[PDB]
Amino acid sequence: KAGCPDNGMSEEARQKFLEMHNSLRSSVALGQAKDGAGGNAPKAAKMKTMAYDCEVEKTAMNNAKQCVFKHSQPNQRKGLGENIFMSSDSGMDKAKAAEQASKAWFGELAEKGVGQNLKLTGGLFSRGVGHYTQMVWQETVKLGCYVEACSNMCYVVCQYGPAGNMMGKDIYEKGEPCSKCENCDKEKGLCSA
Ligand SMILES: [Cu+2]
């Protein structure tokens, strides 16, 4: 989503990654996202808009290029969170891969459930909802992803600027959409500043 190298990642997939993230973040912020723990996830008072970041993309790429389904080590993605995903459809369209990965990550909310308490306790963390929580981490505002076709898998890595999943921190501040920021549409619920 703008001015990134012609590095095997397409502008279509980039757009898809960003759009899924913002959409899903919006749906959560509006109180519209189904929580398998019951009801909908709580409204967010200042859910931030994400922007696509080519520099973040390039560190995600170093992971994706290796074609081993593995979480990179922290110093390989200095100060950035990370989500990973794989499909057996090796030659999958990259925008399609972007959509499937985003849904799989975000799917942890409806399936495993989170609940009304958004403090990231060790207990919540080890429940396996960590791809979701990074997707909707209020303070995370940069996204960079890479989709690599490998021998026997389509391998997808997203990295997240300001890292999320800090233990003890709230995934996001609860409250009515936009109540805690200026540049925000109450029908959308995403803050741009
Ligand atoms: Cu993971």
CA of 84 to the centre of ligand 1 (A): 5
Give the burial string for 143-162 (b: 16+ CB within 10 Å, else e).
bbbbbbbeeebbbbbbbbbe
Cα atoms in the 13 Å half-sphere on the side-chain side of 176: 4
Q: Residue 53's CB: how many other CB atoms inside 10 A?
A: 24
Span from the CA of 180 to the centroid of ligand 1 (angstroms):
30
CATH number of this structure's domain 1-193: 3.40.33.10
Do the strands 154-161 and 81-87 form a parallel or antiparallel pair, or are they unpaired? antiparallel
Under 8 Å between Cβ of 142 and 8: no
Residue 52 zone, left/alpha/beta (φ > 0; ψ -120 to 50; rest): beta
Inter-residue contact 17 to 98 (CB < 8 Å): yes
| In contact, 43 and 176? CB cutoff 8 Å | yes
Q: How far is the CA of 111 from the centre of ligand 1 (A)?
A: 16
Burial of 23 (0-12, 13-18, 19+ CB in 10 A): middle
Rounded distance between C-alpha atoms, residue 122 and residue 84, angstroms: 21
Nearest-angstrom CA–CA distance, 104 and 131: 9
**Is-contact 134 160, C-beta < 8 A?**
yes
Give buried/exposed letters for 62-83 (b at 16+ CB in 10 A, else e).
ebbeeeeeeebeeeebeebbbb
Structure determined by: X-ray
Task: State the DSSP string of the chain.
Answer: --S---SS--HHHHHHHHHHHHHHHHHHHTT-SBPTTSSBPPPBSSPBPPEE-HHHHHHHHHHHTT-S--PPPGGGGTT-EEEEEEES-TT--HHHHHHHHHHHHHTHHHHH---S--B--HHHHTTT-HHHHHHT-TT--EEEEEEEE-SS-EEEEEEEES----TTSBSS-BSSTTTT-SSB-TTT--B--
Q: Is 71 labeled as ligand-binding? A: yes
For the beta carbon of residue 92, count every other beta carbon within 10 angstroms: 17
> Which of these, 151, 156, 140, lies nearest to 70 by C-alpha position?
156
Cβ burial of 59 (10 Å; 0-12, 13-18, 19+) is buried
Tell me, in Å, the resolution of the deposited structure: 2.2
**For the chain, which residues make up each domain, given as ranges?**
1-193
